[PDB]
Design an enzyme around this catalytic site. Structure first.
Site, PDB file in Angstrom:
ATOM      1  CD  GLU A 117      -3.279  -0.193   0.463  1.00 17.25           C
ATOM      2  OE1 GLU A 117      -4.086   0.314  -0.339  1.00 17.25           O
ATOM      3  OE2 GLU A 117      -3.323  -1.392   0.804  1.00 17.25           O
ATOM      4  CB  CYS A 136      -0.770   7.548   0.736  1.00 17.68           C
ATOM      5  SG  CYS A 136       0.559   7.089   1.885  1.00 17.68           S
TER       6      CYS A 136
HETATM    7  O1  LIG Z   1      -3.139   7.627   2.540  1.00 22.13           O
HETATM    8  C1  LIG Z   1      -3.110   7.201   3.677  1.00 22.13           C
HETATM    9  C2  LIG Z   1      -4.410   6.774   4.239  1.00 22.13           C
HETATM   10  C3  LIG Z   1      -5.252   5.903   3.550  1.00 22.13           C
HETATM   11  C4  LIG Z   1      -6.467   5.537   4.122  1.00 22.13           C
HETATM   12  C5  LIG Z   1      -6.843   6.042   5.353  1.00 22.13           C
HETATM   13  C6  LIG Z   1      -6.012   6.912   6.033  1.00 22.13           C
HETATM   14  C7  LIG Z   1      -4.789   7.283   5.474  1.00 22.13           C
HETATM   15  O2  LIG Z   1      -3.927   8.144   6.110  1.00 22.13           O
END
Ligand SMILES: O=Cc1ccccc1O
Ligand SMILES: O=Cc1ccccc1O
Ligand SMILES: O=Cc1ccccc1O
Lengths: 484, 484
Positions: free
Chosen positions: B251, B285
């Site tokens: 991920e 992200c």
């Molecule tokens: O991108 C990072 C992320 C993805 C899903 C939920 C919280 C997050 O910080």
């Protein structure tokens, strides 16, 4: 001898350097097939073709995909005698194994064809108002499919049919030992009427394989990779794909055991053992490589197993029929086996039937009283040889099965099925067969292993995720609220 | 300041060398948390614990798993004020982002809990007579879960809840920037009553992270690995797992775009843009890192975007409330951003609002007229900065979106939804939101990306395959026929 070319954009062509390589018979040294020897340049041309074709191929509807794939199956069956003949020459396959390969290949294409309308996503509940939340399964792009020589036809078929029905195009890298067969399967796809560049075929001398693979994996056009072959090479492939964060479907080695409990129908187990051990000279990744038998029953079981095994026919299918034990693939196969053989034998193992090998020639061989300190205990041996490990009790059986570094296929024989199920469910194997052989594969059923056998899956519904993008899509109202 | 230990076998303990490491505030240098500094020895102890616990945990029924996970959610919600407080201190999270993290974490555990009875296989048709063919979904074993600091709570939750409900045990490697929060989430799991060794928690100074990871990946006990973090590190993790043929859920990074067509509800798009760009200082992200806007509309859209953005509150959530733009995580974050900033600015980019950074402090910044020769065009920038790429037409929009090396999340704004769908369906992204922001995540919906964003998936039904063994099992008659 047979003459074979490369295949790019609905065109059969020589390699960029007009160079060839040969597949000589492993015992006679006679030239069976002369093939175009692809270069890295050819490989990139193949990827570019696949990428370019993907532009239209990804949008072809389910009806047309199904029709086309169905036709491939029809076309492959129409060429059955040639497959039998070529596979006998190239990889020492008996008519039994060749004929099966064709049936299995045609069926893969039909199963894939059937799946055309079955590649589905979901519509999913959401708390958000006036919003559709859903998943889509879409094509990926050019797939790199690397295919070995043993399941000569079906292993290619699986690595083409499935990525095709998922709307992908493929660079098909064939085997140095099977270039006529892999060219043939390609030809079948061509004659079914697949659009140009949807399937592209490459083969090479083994000295070129690594760099051709590296170039394709490092190629921006190639999106995912499926590899079938040795664990040794599989790791190396995956290491390369990791440098470019590419997903791999890894279909690797096995040490597939037949568990014979104290409860077993010995007649039935011997039959499964004989079949799974010596079909295609034990050159199947799921060939029965271990017989874990309860001590209470071992002596009797081993005796029957040996009786049947000795009676098996040895010979060359390209010269004569009814050969159960054909020649192995390479004048080297016996060199690996003998290393394993000597080690076991020096450490107390007992040759209950058979003998050592020489080049690609070996009698059906069974070793008894194999123990965990012998290399052959868990090292895969691609040949008409198999080992007996004796054990005491259900628990120790599970232990021995689970202590393998592989986990492809397995069989569990016991008259009490409740028990057989306990062990069956506890063992770490992609395929478990209760009172069945270790050598099974149906297209409706997922095929793959755990541990050193790799990861990912061909066949069944599971193969779909391997060659699709799963996309989470929402359709939202224009007016919505935000915290800031 | 807060004091934090390691967690192995329902026991909070010091590291094998009684050594610690600190999380200092990135701007004040004040010590926020002192944590036990795990050694490789501690990591192996953690894996062994996980392996040992797996022996009983794999056989725990669905009812008990659901009850336990449901309780975790209840327990996490009961500790909401502490999460808000700790996340504000450690990672500069506003109450908005902290509060959301808790809700999201609790919901993950509930969704996972719900799935307990939904981890199912199939009973499959077979030509073979008197035979049951079926698939089973079983537990895998110890899972290595590596979790970053940004989605401080929910990213941990996802990497625990799901492997737990699938009957696995986990070695949880936390973040050097978030040790109090990750210890806390662990504590919640402990207080829900999870059996000893089912969840084991490790944290360390970043100088130790690589070797601790290497030891766990090379560890026989660890069966699969999920990693959330930078593409840079993700490749390295996958390369290590490839040496041992282990499956990875990756991920990784994103450059998530908001596509604003000439058709867009500019009001609605600006709101989505403002939100997705600057939530948690663009340290998500999936933070909106690109605004691809049609030239016909760009000037107007950019003007509104800039107006809203300038008005946003800057400050430190641990000192004061209502901060939209908190401090970044490290006195280094601005050093990376500025390198990207200077490069863009020297190549013609235009600062339409904001300015450069210093340590972890930066004003909300928007760059306009960003072009493909600038590093910031596709390089991920973890900060309160975002770029505008102007384009002409639907086709060029798709091109620009698809030319990213990443493919995590995306949004497409257009009043003609038929059109928005065309681009939405053509772009290479794990998440596409039609008239929605790029920052969305629901537990019912699969979360992941393509390309350099990695592979595999958390959330939704798709996460199940990530933490299960899929086994093909047959139950066959005693009497059956074999070719030889
Ligand atoms: O991108 C990072 C992320 C993805 C899903 C939920 C919280 C997050 O910080
Ligand atoms: O083990 C190799 C294999 C697997 C499925 C079908 C045919 C094969 O040769
Ligand atoms: O890196 C490991 C991995 C896991 C699932 C699929 C493909 C992969 O390369």
């Amino acid at each position: 001898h047979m003459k074979t070319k490369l295949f790019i954009n609905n065109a059969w062509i020589d390699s960029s350097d007009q160079q060839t390589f040969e597949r000589k018979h492993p015992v006679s040294s006679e030239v069976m097939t002369e093939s175009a020897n692809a270069t890295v340049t050819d490989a990139i041309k193949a990827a570019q073709a696949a990428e370019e074709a993907f532009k239209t191929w990804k949008d072809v509807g389910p009806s047309e995909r199904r029709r086309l794939l169905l036709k491939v199956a029809d076309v492959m069956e129409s060429k059955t005698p040639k497959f039998i003949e070529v596979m006998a020459m190239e990889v020492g396959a008996s008519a039994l194994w060749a004929g099966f390969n064709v049936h299995a290949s045609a069926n893969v294409f039909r199963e894939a064809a059937s799946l055309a309308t079955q590649i589905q996503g979901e519509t999913i509940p959401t708390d958000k108002a006036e919003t559709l939340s859903m998943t889509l399964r879409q094509p990926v792009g050019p797939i790199l499919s690397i295919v070995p020589w043993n399941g000569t036809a079906v292993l290619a078929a699986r690595a083409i049919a499935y990525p095709l029905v998922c709307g992908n195009t493929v660079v098909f890298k064939g085997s140095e030992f099977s270039p006529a067969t892999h060219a043939l399967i390609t030809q079948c796809v061509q004659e079914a009427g697949l659009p140009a560049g949807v399937l592209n075929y490459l083969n090479s001398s083994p000295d070129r394989s690594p760099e051709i693979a590296d170039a394709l994996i490092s190629a921006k056009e190639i999106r995912r990779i499926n590899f079938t072959g040795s664990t040794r090479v599989g790791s190396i492939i995956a290491q390369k794909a990791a440098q470019h964060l590419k997903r791999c479907l890894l279909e690797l080695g096995g040490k597939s055991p037949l568990i014979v409990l104290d409860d077993a129908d010995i007649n039935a187990a011997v039959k499964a053992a004989v079949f799974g051990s010596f079909l295609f000279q034990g050159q199947i990744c799921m060939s029965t490589e271990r017989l874990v038998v309860d001590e209470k029953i071992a002596d009797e079981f081993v005796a029957r197993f040996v009786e049947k095994t000795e009676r098996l026919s040895v010979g060359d299918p390209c010269l004569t029929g009814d050969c159960i034990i054909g020649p192995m693939v390479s004048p080297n196969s016996g060199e690996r086996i003998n290393g394993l053989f000597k080690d076991a034998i020096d450490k107390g193992a007992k040759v209950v039937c058979g003998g050592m090998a020489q080049g690609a020639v070996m009698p059906a061989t069974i070793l008894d009283h194999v123990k965990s300190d012998m290399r052959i205990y868990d090292e895969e041996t691609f040949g008409p040889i198999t080992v007996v490990i004796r054990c005491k009790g259900e628990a120790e059986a599970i232990r021995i099965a689970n202590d393998s570094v592989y986990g492809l296929s397995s069989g569990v024989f016991g008259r009490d099925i409740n028990r057989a199920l306990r062990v069956g469910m506890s063992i770490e194997y992609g395929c478990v067969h209760i009172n069945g052989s270790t050598v099974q594969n149906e297209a409706q059923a997922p095929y793959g292993g755990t541990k050193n056998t790799g990861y990912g899956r061909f066949d069944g519904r599971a193969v779909i995720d391997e060659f699709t993008e799963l996309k989470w899509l929402t359709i939202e109202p224009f007016e919505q609220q935000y915290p800031f």
